[PDB]
Amino acid sequence: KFEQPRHGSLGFLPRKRASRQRGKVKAFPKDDASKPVHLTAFLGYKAGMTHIVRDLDRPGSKMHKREILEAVTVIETPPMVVVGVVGYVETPRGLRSLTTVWAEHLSEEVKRRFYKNWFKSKKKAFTKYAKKYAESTQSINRELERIKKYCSVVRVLAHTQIRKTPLAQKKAHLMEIQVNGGSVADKVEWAREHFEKTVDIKSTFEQNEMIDVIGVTRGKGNEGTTARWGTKRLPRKTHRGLRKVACIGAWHPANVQWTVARAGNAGYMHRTQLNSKIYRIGAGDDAKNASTDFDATEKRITPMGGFVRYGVVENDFVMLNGATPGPVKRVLTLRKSLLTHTSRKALEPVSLKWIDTASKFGHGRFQTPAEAKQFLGTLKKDVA
Amino acid sequence: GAASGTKYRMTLGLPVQAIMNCADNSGAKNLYIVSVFGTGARLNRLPAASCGDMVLATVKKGKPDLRKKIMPAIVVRQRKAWRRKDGVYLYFEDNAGVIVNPKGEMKGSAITGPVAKECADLWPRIASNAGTVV
Amino acid sequence: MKVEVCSFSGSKVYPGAGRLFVRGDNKVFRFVNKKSESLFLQRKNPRRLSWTVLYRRMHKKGI
RNA sequence: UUCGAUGGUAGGAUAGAGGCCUACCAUGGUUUUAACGGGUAACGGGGAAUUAGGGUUCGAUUCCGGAGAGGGAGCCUGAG
RNA sequence: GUCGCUACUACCGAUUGAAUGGCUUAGUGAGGCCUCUGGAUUGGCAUUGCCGAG
RNA sequence: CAGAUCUUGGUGGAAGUAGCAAAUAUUCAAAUGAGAACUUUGAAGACUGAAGUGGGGAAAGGUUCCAUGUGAACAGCAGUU
RNA sequence: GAAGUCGGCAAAAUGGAUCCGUAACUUCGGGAUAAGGAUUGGCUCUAAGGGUUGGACAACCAACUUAGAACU
RNA sequence: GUAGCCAAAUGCCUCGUCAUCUAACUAGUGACGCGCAUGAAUGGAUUAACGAGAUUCCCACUGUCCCUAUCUACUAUCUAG
RNA sequence: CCAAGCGUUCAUAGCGACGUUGCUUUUUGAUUCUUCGAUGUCGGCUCUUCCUAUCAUACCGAAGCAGAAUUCGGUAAGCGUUGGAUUGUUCACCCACUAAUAGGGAACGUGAGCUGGGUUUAGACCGUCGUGAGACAGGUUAGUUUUACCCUACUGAUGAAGUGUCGUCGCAAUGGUAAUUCAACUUAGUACGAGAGGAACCGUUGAUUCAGAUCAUUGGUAUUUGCGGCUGCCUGACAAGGCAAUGCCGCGGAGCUAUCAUCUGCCGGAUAACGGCUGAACGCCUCUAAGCCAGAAUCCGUGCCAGAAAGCGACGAUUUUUUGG
RNA sequence: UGUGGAACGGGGUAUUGUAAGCAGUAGAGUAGCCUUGUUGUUACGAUCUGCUGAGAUUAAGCCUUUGUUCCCAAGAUUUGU
């Protein structure tokens, strides 16, 4: 007796390590042939977290027309490079890839993806493909026409520009992004003109848009049932430990059931968090990335001393509200929402009033080096 | 329940068996929290209250007439810090409450010490007898 | 968007920084961090602690 | 009798004497002739009532003295 | 005298008894006074810092 | 003889598994040696802290005492000790 | 702040010394360190409490305590 | 069954009746006694002090708990034997 | 099931005797078929799953102005069913909250999971009985809770290739799945209603429980032995250090972590009860016989988690003038 | 052998709280020495003040670096339609 809800959710099983790291899109948004051709996904890198202050526009709320403080996550999103197109035909056994067409020239970043030791390799990855592309230019057109004639789903191959990111990893992340819009012919044509071309973050997503964040969570290693499933700690008198489940099963069935909490892996799992609102899409070529209409100080989106364990964000970035799966510097997937949003919270425009740029390496109290200079005056090493 | 509308979530700091001070001139010196109104069902979880809650309490030290009986009370101060919606963490120097009726009208007439803003908005009768707010 | 001043160290307090303590004598104190709050609870004197702006103002540090 | 209760020395403060206060030195001072404590439904006296004498009761109240301006505490002006 | 029966008084009285006023216990402590600083301004010195009131 | 929780002897799976975690703590260089984490020397860092991990005895043991050599068995790792 | 648990199990809290103060009950011996309070460092001083010894005294040598004060 | 004593470590009925504490106790204590089946050196009653005896309550205090979290050393792990 | 009846008045609104037909039994009892070369034995804690004989939540029907309240009534077990004083207890009774504090099974679920409060017969006291040793439709006190390193199950972690090799990007058969409830306000003083009174669809703002993440802020943690402070001893003194099994104290970045902090948590089809349409049978009527809609928190899907290690697809390069191909 | 890596150094960001040394009579005061001072020298003295927002640490899971010095142009195994 004394009923209580079960510990944990059976939908997130098995609690094993994810087989991937990038984070894949399990379902792209439903295609519409009326809206123009556009992308449905993007890749970025989690630079860190900060907090903002903004006026809450929500009639009927207690804090209506009053400032609120909210935590946000910054994801660096430099433009991605489209290097290929993949067509999928709708078979009675699912979606099947028919053929893949690549660009004539591929960068070193994307070419590193096909190798474990690129430096020791002979750098022969698309040499014959480029030769076929330059020989007479009929096979590429034939394959593109095949994708146009057949196939119902078109996905472009795009890779991140990790070179202009402070990450030590030189290998770029490659991903298939489904192309939604009118007609397969326009999708293939759009891919063809975008070969060896960069797609920016603001062309894919816009301000106040609700998106989904897909990524692998922070690794936690092995963990007991107390922290893996949130079970009750056993009394202090418990012999042979107290951080376990007292009863893991009953007689008949003479087996341990799959619904009983057990110790094991507790982290590094694939997740997709829904309904993340875009608070700001900032560019990498302006000095007012973190400046608002109520704070005219020319400052960029970077804490004092740089982002902790990440560096300096000099590219385009997003300011999704709340938290996102995965640790800092992990690659995250941004996907268009599969649902329709009509609530006040979803449709409320966001106008930031202040963005914190103080150091996250401690109890920072200065937003900018100029503010630190004015407050502290002259120091011993400062004057001499 | 049904004080002036809705109150934002606040950090609970006054569970059952907590003895807080009495911040009115009803004649009671402390309030011993017996139960908290609005508490749901959860195994082993002790009901707890924040500022502006509508706990039931008994008088442990005070007038014998006020002792040995249950009475509604509203929590006005708590030691545990809670976060406002504007990202401000605040707390008081003591845990204090005031004896009220089920409708929320204070049995006393004057409130000594500051009163939390959330309690003031929720219960207008408390705000009238209160002095400074926050 | 206002910026407060710490009641102990005198440092500028941006929103979402430190804590707020309201005393029984209806006085409001804003502490920039736990160090300032702990020293206040320990009854340390800001005019005595060398790193506080009140000490610097009293002693005319920096001219 | 500590954080001054008894006396001595010195000093400070007071308009002035003074354990009024301060530092030191001795343990002293009152008391069954009632010290100390408690109640007073106690401001005190000239005086009033009863009237053999002796006594008993009262005095908030036209005069004298004391304290007070809800309760203590502190101070300026001013000879006060 | 006993029990039976009625109104009333006082004591003890568990309830670790409560509450009004005084005597203390430890901390905190407004305000005036004295005292150390303190220096908006004035103040004899185009001229300068010195007595300073403050 | 197939049994008797049979007798004696030998040998298995468990298995290169449980385990070899009380008593704070070792490090550098040199010598010997085929071989050095355990031998010796020097240096450094520590502990027992006089009711001691010090110096002696009673009972008990019986050569374990000393010198010179050995490293087959033991010193649950090693060994030049 | 015991709401845990059969049960304050375990842990925490108290703790030395000096100065105040200490109830019911009692076999008058105790209870009692009842309970309940305050102080404690460093430095510089002050006062008092004892030994032999050169012509009312006396320059040493050889000594440890107690109490108090200022400053920090 | 006298003096005493009691739902007592002794009462089945029983969670006896009344009072007290708690917001609430079948607990505890204080009273009552047709006491199944208390009782006077098979000792009755009371008793200061004492008790690593048993029971109830209060203050201080605290991860016992709300509700768990963090840190250190030795294991568990891997390796050589 | 039958209906004598009660139900100002109507046999079944609803109760409903006497009988009768059944289901269950966690009440002990009955027998002795298994176990005495050995199945650890109550309660409590923890944890998972299953049933409906449904307490609440969802949608319906029955009467009466409405609004409450009743049949919980018809489907429905998807999702919840609490905190305390007491009982060792099962049960049961009180204090409150809550939408509700519903009932059971799983060797009367769960001791190589815990505890040992019950039993716990060794020590000891009492009551009754016995001459006695000793006995109990009894009370009380103190009394060792062993072992997994084996197989399987479960939780996590590697892993060979004949079907070319090594990589990149993928599909998804299958298995699992998740959200839940409440308050206030606008509807609205509106429908209704002689009167007082008084809803509902929807929408908005919040909140409870649960689930998955994260560390911007706040709190906690200290071997950052990072900085500073303190005691005893030691290095002749200062300085700088060491020991005191982490010497102690204050702060303390980074990390971890908190329903002590923050973020997020959909809609499509098919239905159950039930309500209708065209419509016969049974020349009419009637949801049903054929057929068509509507319709529950129901079922299955979208989405979410894993990815068959013997399911599959597309793409890339193929031991270099030595050798292999 | 490359927008290569490493070890240091610098800068930034953070933690603590003002380093050692010198000087000052600031210092509660205490003893000697002198022409005898409204700054008398000298000796001891918890502490205080100024150089000093100083000093120390700062990746070990912080950021940055056109600074300095080195290093890598190797070895072994497997794999064929």
UniProtKB/Swiss-Prot annotation, chain A:
One of its GO terms (biological process) is translation. GO terms for molecular function: RNA binding; structural constituent of ribosome. Residues 1-6 have a biased composition (Basic and acidic residues). The modification Phosphoserine is found at residues 9, 61, 136, 139, 203, 291, 351. Keywords: Cytoplasm, Phosphoprotein, Ribonucleoprotein, Ribosomal protein. GO terms for cellular component: cytosol; cytosolic large ribosomal subunit; preribosome. PROSITE patterns: RIBOSOMAL_L3 (PS00474). Residues 14-27 have a biased composition (Basic residues). The modification Phosphothreonine is found at residue 368. It is found in: Cytoplasm. Component of the large ribosomal subunit (LSU). Mature yeast ribosomes consist of a small (40S) and a large (60S) subunit. The 40S small subunit contains 1 molecule of ribosomal RNA (18S rRNA) and at least 33 different proteins. The large 60S subunit contains 3 rRNA molecules (25S, 5.8S and 5S rRNA) and at least 46 different proteins. uL3 forms together with ES39L one of the contact sites for the signal recognition particle that targets ribosomes to the endoplasmic reticulum membrane. Belongs to the universal ribosomal protein uL3 family. This is Large ribosomal subunit protein uL3A. It comes from Schizosaccharomyces pombe (strain 972 / ATCC 24843) (Fission yeast). The gene is rpl301.
UniProtKB/Swiss-Prot annotation, chain B:
InterPro entries: Ribosomal_uL14, Ribosomal_uL14_CS, Ribosomal_uL14_sf. It is found in: Cytoplasm; Nucleus. Keywords: Cytoplasm, Nucleus, Ribonucleoprotein, Ribosomal protein. It holds the Pfam family Ribosomal_L14. Component of the ribosome, a large ribonucleoprotein complex responsible for the synthesis of proteins in the cell. The small ribosomal subunit (SSU) binds messenger RNAs (mRNAs) and translates the encoded message by selecting cognate aminoacyl-transfer RNA (tRNA) molecules. The large subunit (LSU) contains the ribosomal catalytic site termed the peptidyl transferase center (PTC), which catalyzes the formation of peptide bonds, thereby polymerizing the amino acids delivered by tRNAs into a polypeptide chain. Belongs to the universal ribosomal protein uL14 family. This is Large ribosomal subunit protein uL14B. It comes from Schizosaccharomyces pombe (strain 972 / ATCC 24843). The gene is rpl2302.
Swiss-Prot record, chain C:
The modification Phosphoserine is found at residue 50. It is found in: Cytoplasm. Belongs to the eukaryotic ribosomal protein eL24 family. Component of the large ribosomal subunit (LSU). Mature yeast ribosomes consist of a small (40S) and a large (60S) subunit. The 40S small subunit contains 1 molecule of ribosomal RNA (18S rRNA) and at least 33 different proteins. The large 60S subunit contains 3 rRNA molecules (25S, 5.8S and 5S rRNA) and at least 46 different proteins. There are 2 genes for eL24 in S.pombe. Component of the ribosome, a large ribonucleoprotein complex responsible for the synthesis of proteins in the cell. The small ribosomal subunit (SSU) binds messenger RNAs (mRNAs) and translates the encoded message by selecting cognate aminoacyl-transfer RNA (tRNA) molecules. The large subunit (LSU) contains the ribosomal catalytic site termed the peptidyl transferase center (PTC), which catalyzes the formation of peptide bonds, thereby polymerizing the amino acids delivered by tRNAs into a polypeptide chain. This is Large ribosomal subunit protein eL24B. The chain holds residues 1 to 63 of 149 of the full protein.
